[PDB]
């Protein structure tokens, strides 16, 4: 479950990517239905993915992605992090952004 979303669509989501290196962070934020939410719901799921309240979502928070939709779903692989990473971080400074995040969920 997470805040705003339907529960079958993120036990769907955490479905699809049952297996070590399928997880396609784009696939999944169009899954549970994200990608379909406005640019102020994003913003707000970032600040929840953003565990440790540092204002971006480091690497360890990107391997922990799952956990904020279910305690006991698995650990990104670190190939699947850091796919995640590069994606994602389009100033280059190692980390992700509250912008960056809405960039990469809202096409
Ligand atoms: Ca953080
Ligand atoms: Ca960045
Ligand atoms: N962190």
């Given at each position: 479950s997470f805040?705003?979303?339907?529960?079958?669509?993120?036990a769907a989501a955490?479905?699809?990517?049952?297996?070590?290196?399928?997880?396609?962070?784009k696939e999944?934020?169009?899954?549970?239905?994200l990608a379909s939410k406005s640019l102020d719901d994003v913003k707000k799921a970032f600040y929840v993915i953003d565990?440790?309240?540092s204002g971006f979502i480091e690497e360890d928070?990107?391997?922990?992605?799952?956990?904020?939709?279910?305690?006991?779903?698995?650990?990104?692989?670190?190939?699947?992090?850091?796919?995640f990473l590069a994606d994602g971080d389009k100033d280059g400074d190692g980390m992700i952004g509250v912008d960056e995040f809405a960039a990469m969920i809202k096409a």
């Open positions: 805040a705003g979303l339907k529960d079958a669509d993120v955490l479905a699809a990517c049952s297996a070590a290196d399928s997880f396609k962070h999944f934020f169009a899954k549970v239905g565990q440790d309240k928070e990107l391997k922990l992605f799952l956990q904020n939709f279910s305690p006991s779903a698995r650990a990104l692989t670190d190939a699947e992090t850091k796919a």
